[PDB]
Amino acid sequence: HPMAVTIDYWDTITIKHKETKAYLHSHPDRYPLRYDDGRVSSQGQQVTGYPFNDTNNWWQILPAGPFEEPKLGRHVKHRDLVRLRHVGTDTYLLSHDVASPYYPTNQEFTTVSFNEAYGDRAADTLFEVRIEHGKPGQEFKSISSHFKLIHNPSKVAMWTHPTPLPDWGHRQQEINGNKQIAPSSNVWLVEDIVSLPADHKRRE
Ligand code: NA
Incomplete structure (x- = not known):
């Protein structure tokens, strides 16, 4: 497929849910302190699934360890640990054992600052591809x-x-952490390497 290209660290990508077609998305709005059932959220930045194309779908895929200046040509590989940086808010994807908006059994997904992602909350920002x-x-x-x-x-x-989600989440889809890995509803794909120009050698 001409649009199937190896993804490298520091690329900016869109991440699309196979079954619902929603894009992984974020924006400045936060989870409410309380849900209707009385549970308490982290009040962190919302992470949602969004059906349309906009800049809030863009995530930069980054390595898992200490900060380093950008390098070219480092391919992401199966089972690598990565971070995902939301470009529009300059925050880093995170999950933790706080119950999600609609599923008391599933983990909330949110984002955190650079200082948190490379500091005391670093482990919670690492995801395996x-x-x-x-x-x-x-x-x-x-x-x-x-x-x-x-x-x-x-x-x-x-x-x-x-x-x-309710109006507080812009009626977008919930993103949360499923305890079961086997379901096909856990499958995503990268639709576009946004940062990689159309004339780049990597596309040849
Ligand atoms: Na582009």
């Missing part, structure tokens, strides 16, 4: 690498479903 049918050393590619995104501390899978 588990390619469906992946083999050791296999390169992660746009379009063709269907994958599950596994939170490294807890082994929950990033998940979504169709029933929209």
Whole structure:
């Protein structure tokens, strides 16, 4: 497929849910302190699934360890640990054992600052890219690498479903951590390497 290209660290990408077609998304709005059932959220930045194309779908895929200046040509591979930086808010994807908006059993997904992501909350910002049918050393590619995104501390899978969030979440889809990895509803794909120009050698 001409749009199936190996993804490199520091690329900016869009991440699309295979079954619902929603894009992984974020924006400045926060989770409410209390849900209707009385549970308490982290009040962190919302992470949602959004059906349309906009800049709030853009995430930069980054390495898992200490901060380093950008390098070119470092391919992401099956089962690598990664961070995902939301470009529009300059925050870092995080999950933790706080119950999600609609599923008391599933982990909340949110974002955190650079200082948190490379400091005391670093472990909670690491996610494994588990390619469906992946083999050791296999390169992660746009379009063709269907994958599950596994939170490294807890082994929950990033998940979504169709029933929209309330108005506080802009009636977008919930994103949370599924305790079961096997379901096909845990499958995502990278639709576009946004940062990689159309004339770049990597597309040849
Ligand atoms: Na582009």
